[PDB]
Amino acid sequence: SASFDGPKFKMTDGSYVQTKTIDVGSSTDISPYLSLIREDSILNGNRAVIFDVYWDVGFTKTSGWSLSSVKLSTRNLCLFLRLPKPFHDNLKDLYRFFASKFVTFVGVQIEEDLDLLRENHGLVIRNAINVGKLAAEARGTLVLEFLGTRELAHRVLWSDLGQLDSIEAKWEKAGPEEQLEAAAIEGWLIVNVWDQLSDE
Amino acid sequence: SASFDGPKFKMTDGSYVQTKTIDVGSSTDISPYLSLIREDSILNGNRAVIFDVYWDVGFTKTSGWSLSSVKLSTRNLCLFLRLPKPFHDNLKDLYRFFASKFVTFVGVQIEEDLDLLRENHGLVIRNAINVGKLAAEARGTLVLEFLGTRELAHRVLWSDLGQLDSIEAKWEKAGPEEQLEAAAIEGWLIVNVWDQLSDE
Amino acid sequence: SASFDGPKFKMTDGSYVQTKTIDVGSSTDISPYLSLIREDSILNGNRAVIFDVYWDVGFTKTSGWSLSSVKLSTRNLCLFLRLPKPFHDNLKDLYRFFASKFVTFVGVQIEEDLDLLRENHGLVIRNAINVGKLAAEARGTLVLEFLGTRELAHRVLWSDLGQLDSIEAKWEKAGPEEQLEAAAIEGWLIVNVWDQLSDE
Amino acid sequence: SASFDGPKFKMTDGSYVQTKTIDVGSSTDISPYLSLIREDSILNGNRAVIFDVYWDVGFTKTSGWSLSSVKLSTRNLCLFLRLPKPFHDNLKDLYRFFASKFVTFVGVQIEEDLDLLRENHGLVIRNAINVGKLAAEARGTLVLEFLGTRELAHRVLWSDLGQLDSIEAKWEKAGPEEQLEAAAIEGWLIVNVWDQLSDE
Amino acid sequence: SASFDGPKFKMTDGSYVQTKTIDVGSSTDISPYLSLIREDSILNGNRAVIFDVYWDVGFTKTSGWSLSSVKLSTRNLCLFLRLPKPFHDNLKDLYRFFASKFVTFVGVQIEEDLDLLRENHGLVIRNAINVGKLAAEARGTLVLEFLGTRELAHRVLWSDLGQLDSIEAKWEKAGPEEQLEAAAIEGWLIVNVWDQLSDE
Amino acid sequence: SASFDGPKFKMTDGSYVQTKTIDVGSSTDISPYLSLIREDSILNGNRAVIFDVYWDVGFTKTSGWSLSSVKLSTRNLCLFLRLPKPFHDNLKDLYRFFASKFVTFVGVQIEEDLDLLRENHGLVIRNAINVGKLAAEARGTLVLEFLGTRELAHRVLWSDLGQLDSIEAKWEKAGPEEQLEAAAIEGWLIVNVWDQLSDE
């Protein structure tokens, strides 16, 4: 079965979120996993796919960083790829995926990650939006442009952030489980941020 | 006589799009169809040609991308071109066409493709229009420059995208003619978005 | 001596455009015909000059793009310089005049062109205007920067464009003579587009 | 367990800034201190982390700038990290901190630092803000974009800075502990700045 | 003693301009003339000298172009310097004059000029301004930005340009002395253009 | 000991400025001199230092320029620095100076001056401002952004500049002490410009 069989997490408005963490290896087909997300975004999430990237530090002086992970969030799905260093050819599906015009790619503070993706991986997100700028602008409030995730979720939702803060506040001690929950939470939270700004 | 003898599709308006697919070689002459694209553009299309490009992704980093397909749509026609790698001289017709000032090349989210196209192929579209932004400014809706081909149509024309969302939701399993049909409805959706935008 | 003794065309408002075409080799003198345009442009056109360019696309990929000819139009004249490859020193006069302050160089869809001219042939134009943008602003119509040629002047001079549309509609079946008419007419139109713009 | 046993500096409002200065060697684990910064910022500072970097100038013409120290501040704590010459792997923690998204990074006059951090160490603060600008825009007082750490605190807050001015005025002669107080004073000060602008 | 011992020209406002021409070889001392320009721009020229440049085009492709001529003039004076290829140490003072902050350097279309001068001669103009460029905004007429030297004067001052128009209307049919006339008149007009935008 | 014992000059309002001129070789210690400027700046000079630079032009095309003169001005002191070529270790004291955010480095027409400092010497000014632009936004006059040092001061302070003007007008006949006089004057003027705008 190609389904999302990792832990479900309970949000704040009653809904839940699944899981699918893969230790992406050289011949790990991640396409069927990329399908759902797409299917879910198109049928259930208004065609937005929320994301985030994680970099292994490195040593142009930033040509050493490695794209160690990626988060993709829609209505009902979140996939966590723990990409390999270095990339193998099975990753074309990853590149092909990010170049699609079916969905807008939503992320917070991505200007830098995008140049990195370009210079260090040749990955192009043809349809991306750094969402803090549109947030601040749609609202005429400059400060939203310079907010991190948790805090950008607050100046747009106010939903209860206590649980997310308890995990983030103690991130050094948080096991892969609470760490995954924080990623699903803000992965869902930014979905709510975008629905609000564009459904407006 | 030079003709679009491929499958025909019906839009949410009884209209019928005439298609053609050329697997261009190193001795093929595609000029009779681009000329048919230009004619329908001038005579009955307010000199707009809508387009999209499709790359063979690759691993200077964005050096792996290579134009594998080009779609050119006019109100009446949709010309889908599957291209080889590398190009041969016979494709000079495509460069010459895209550099034309007779019509405006209407694309959706082509900012990265216009550049990868310029840098990777030398295919200058002197008169291209990333159509997105115009929408946001004209309609006074910030999110328009930030949507995929469909959602922009939905947000600008609010027509029926039923057949469209269905085929796209299950993309990796859609037959060839289903993928063409999706290209058709999008080509027709944007040729309408444009016609609706240049006159308001 | 020198005079525009080629085909003289009659415009829709009854005016005429004289013409001249030279098959520039590597020894000819093109000054004499450059004077006449600068004469008509200063005495009859008030430093108005409308041009267009044409490239040989060769297989940095745009490095091969070489200039094949240029169109220079004023009030009552249309000059055509068909260029060799490579260029010879007798062509220094086209460079000093295209980059002249004694006059300006109104172009339609020229940003890329300036790039190719400067970067590919050391061709600099110091006083240039990509007229769609000024047209768009001058008259509160965003879509004018994005129109190509016949539609900018349409949206702006609303003049008789049947004959023009009739020819370009079948560009491929047009004799080098009729293609002249189509170019002289769009040149005249654009000079008219600009005479209006500088006054608004 | 971790604590900050360096001196505290009861500010001017009666509060006490707890400080700590660490000499980072090739095996020093600073994760416990950064952990507490993020912890305090999140549970006590609204996820803002103000900062500043210290440069060793050496003899690209700017290739001789050497990041010798970095100051991180929340309302309760100010952490000083003084980097070793060979950056080993135990510094990837610092890098991962400047890259996180859990908090933001607000500095005074940081345009050349980040640019410089990016060129000499491969360090790109994913989410940071050059606050003088936000203050100028937020308040409509352009000049705020051009003030050093103090006139900015002065012109925005108008608080007592006698202790600070008297220390910086005789800077060449200031010893260790005194230097600590100046930056320390400036750390807490900028912490208040962002707090007063983030929601005004 | 060095003086402006060339012809004088009556301007249409009844005033006069004194001029000096010099072909620079290698042992030429131009400093006296520069001093006369500065003194007069300071004493009564309100510290804004009008300056224009001329090029020796030559087969980065534009790196063979040499700053062929340099015109430096204000109200009362005009200096024309024809340069050799390559420069000798005696042109350093031209580089220095062009660097002074005692005055503002004004010229028509300098955008490509400043680039070229920087790139092929290391000659930097530290305190420069595009006159027609400031002319446009200062008047709510976006097209003033794109005017050749004659028209800008025409459209901001609207005087009698018959004499100049007469000469720039038969360029090749004019001797060396006649070229200086237009140059010197080239100046006066911009001088008055600046003064109009002076206290507007 | 270290003090400003050069000529003292009387300004427009009867105040004075003390000078110091240092012929910096490889052994010169501007130490108590960078140190004294910092102080005068802090206690009595409104958190910034007015400053101007001057270049030695020698023959990348702009790499012949060598910073030969650094003028550092404050409330009461005009410190002067003539540099050697190339720099010795004794120039670390200088690089560190302009790296301080204790004061704002206010310059007039510094665009290229900040650019040459970077590519020529790798010298970085973190807290710099090209002040003419600020005056333009504040004082409501477009031109001030394009004014020289004296004209900007004239235009913002309507101060008597007869003294400065007479010296600048005949600059070639001015000796060392007369040029310092003018340099100290322009410094005082910009200092007065800075006090004025900071309050607006």
Name the minimum distance, in Å, from the CA of C195 to any CA of chain B.
21
CB C46 to CB E151 under 8 A?
Answer: yes
Closest residue in F to E93 (Cα) is F57
- In contact, F49 and F39? CB cutoff 8 Å: no
Closest residue to F62, CB basis, from E118, E129, E198? E118
Closest residue to D31, CB basis, from A57, A60, A172? A172
CB proximity B104 to C under 8 Å: yes
Closest residue to F126, CB basis, from D61, D109, D142? D109
**How far out from the chain centre does Cα A46 lie?**
16
CB E124 to CB F169 under 8 A?
Answer: no
CB A151 to CB D46 under 8 A?
Answer: yes
Determine the Cα–Cα distance for residues D118 and C173; give it in Å rounded to an integer. Answer: 57
CB proximity D50 to A under 8 Å: no
> What length is written for chain E?
200
Residues of chain C contacting residue B104, judged by C-beta atoms under 8 Å apart:
146-148, 151
Closest residue to D126, CB basis, from A63, A112, A168? A112
Q: How many CB pairs (< 8 A) connect D and F?
A: 88
Q: What is the DSSP letter of A118?
A: I
Q: What is the DSSP letter of B137?
A: I
Determine the Cα–Cα distance for residues B42 and B52; give it in Å rounded to an integer. Answer: 20
- What's the CA angle centered on B57, arms B52 and B63, to 5 degrees? 105
Burial class (CB within 10 angstroms; exposed 0-12, middle 13-18, buried 19+) of A121:
buried
Closest residue to F148, CB basis, from E101, E137, E198? E101
User: Domains in chain F, please, with CATH?
Assistant: 1-200 (3.30.420.10)
Instruction: Find the farthest-apart pair of alpha carbons in chain A and give their distance in angstroms, rounded.
Output: 47
What are the CA-CA distances from residue A23 to residues A70, A80, C100 (Å)?
Answer: 12, 9, 63
Cβ-based neighbours of E149, under 8 Å, separated by 6 or more: C101, C102, E108, E109, E186, E189, E190
- In contact, A136 and B73? CB cutoff 8 Å: no
Closest residue to F124, CB basis, from D59, D112, D149? D112
CB E150 to CB C121 under 8 A?
Answer: no
Determine the Cα–Cα distance for residues E152 and A114; give it in Å rounded to an integer. Answer: 44
Does the bond joining F84 to the residue before it have cis omega, within 30 degrees of 0? no
CB E148 to CB C138 under 8 A?
Answer: no
Residues of chain C contacting residue B31, judged by C-beta atoms under 8 Å apart:
172
Closest CA to D18 of D97, D80, D93: D80
Closest residue in C to E68 (Cα) is C96
CB proximity A95 to D under 8 Å: no
B139-148 in b/e burial notation, b at 16+ Cβ within 10 A?
eebbbbbbbb
**How far out from the chain centre does Cα C42 lie?**
17
| Tokens of residue E51, six digits | 């300056």
β-pairing, A48-56 vs A66-73, is antiparallel
What are the CA-CA distances from residue D56 to residues D21, D53, D93, F97, F119 (Å)?
Answer: 17, 10, 21, 12, 18
Q: How many CB pairs (< 8 A) connect A and D?
A: 74
Is residue C134 left, alpha or beta, with left meaning phi > 0 and alpha meaning psi from -120 to 50?
Answer: alpha
SS3 category, F36: helix
Closest residue in B to C162 (Cα) is B43
How many other C-beta atoms can be found within 10 angstroms of the C-beta atom of residue D172? 12
Cβ-based neighbours of A49, under 8 Å, separated by 6 or more: A37, A38, A41, A72, A73, A74, A103, A104, A105, A106
What are the CA-CA distances from residue C145 to residues B132, B198, C149, C193, C197 (Å)?
Answer: 14, 11, 10, 13, 13
Instruction: Find the farthest-apart pair of alpha carbons in chain E and give their distance in angstroms, rounded.
Output: 48
Residues of chain C contacting residue B190, judged by C-beta atoms under 8 Å apart:
none
- Note whether C touches E: 3 CB pairs or more under 8 A: yes
CB proximity E59 to C under 8 Å: yes
Determine the Cα–Cα distance for residues E149 and E193; give it in Å rounded to an integer. Answer: 10
Closest CA to D92 of A59, A68, A52, A118: A59
SS3 category, F68: strand
CB proximity C130 to E under 8 Å: no
Closest residue in E to C35 (Cα) is E170
CB C169 to CB B39 under 8 A?
Answer: yes
Sign of the C-alpha dihedral computed for residues A145, A147, A152 and A158 taken in this order: negative
Helix crossing, C150-157 with C131-138: angle to 10°?
Answer: 20
Closest CA to B167 of B153, B155, B181: B181
- In contact, A80 and A69? CB cutoff 8 Å: yes
CB D168 to CB F96 under 8 A?
Answer: no
Strand ranges in F74-183 using DSSP code E only, listed in sequence order? 77-82, 104-107, 128-130
CB D118 to CB A165 under 8 A?
Answer: no
Give the count of alpha carbons within 13 A of E30, CB side only.
29
- Note whether D touches F: 3 CB pairs or more under 8 A: yes
Name the phi and psi angles at D2, rounded to 5: -130, 145
Residue D189 is which amino acid?
Answer: L
In chain F, breaks (C-N over 2.5 A) are found after 59
Give the 3-state secondary structure of chain C: CCCCECCCEECCCCCEEEEEEECCCCCCCCHHHHHHHHHHHHHHCCCCCEEEEEEECCCCHHHCCEEEEEEEECCCEEEEEECCCCCCHHHHHHHHHHCCCCCCEEECCCHHHHHHHHHHHCCCCCCEEEHHHHHHHHCCCHHHCCCCCHHHHHHHHCCCCHHHHHHHCCHHHCCCCHHHHHHHHHHHHHHHHHHHHCCC
Determine the Cα–Cα distance for residues F27 and F25; give it in Å rounded to an integer. Answer: 5
Please tell me what resolution, in angstroms, this structure has.
2.1
Determine the Cα–Cα distance for residues A158 and A36; give it in Å rounded to an integer. Answer: 29
- Note whether D touches C: 3 CB pairs or more under 8 A: no
| Tokens of residue F44, six digits | 């009595």
Q: Which of E62, E74, E126, E194 to mutate to test the interface with F (most CBs of F within 10 A)?
A: E126
Residue D5 is which amino acid?
Answer: D
Query: Could you tell me where the DSSP H helices lie in chain E?
Result: 31-43, 92-97, 111-121, 131-137, 149-157, 162-167, 176-198
Helix crossing, F149-157 with F131-139: angle to 10°?
Answer: 30
- In contact, E148 and E161? CB cutoff 8 Å: no
How many other C-beta atoms can be found within 10 angstroms of the C-beta atom of residue B71? 20
How many other C-beta atoms can be found within 10 angstroms of the C-beta atom of residue A5? 11
Query: Could you tell me where the DSSP H helices lie in E7-148?
Result: 31-43, 92-97, 111-121, 131-137
Residue C135 is which amino acid?
Answer: A
Closest residue to D129, CB basis, from A113, A116, A146? A146
| Tokens of residue F153, six digits | 């001061």
SS3 category, F16: strand
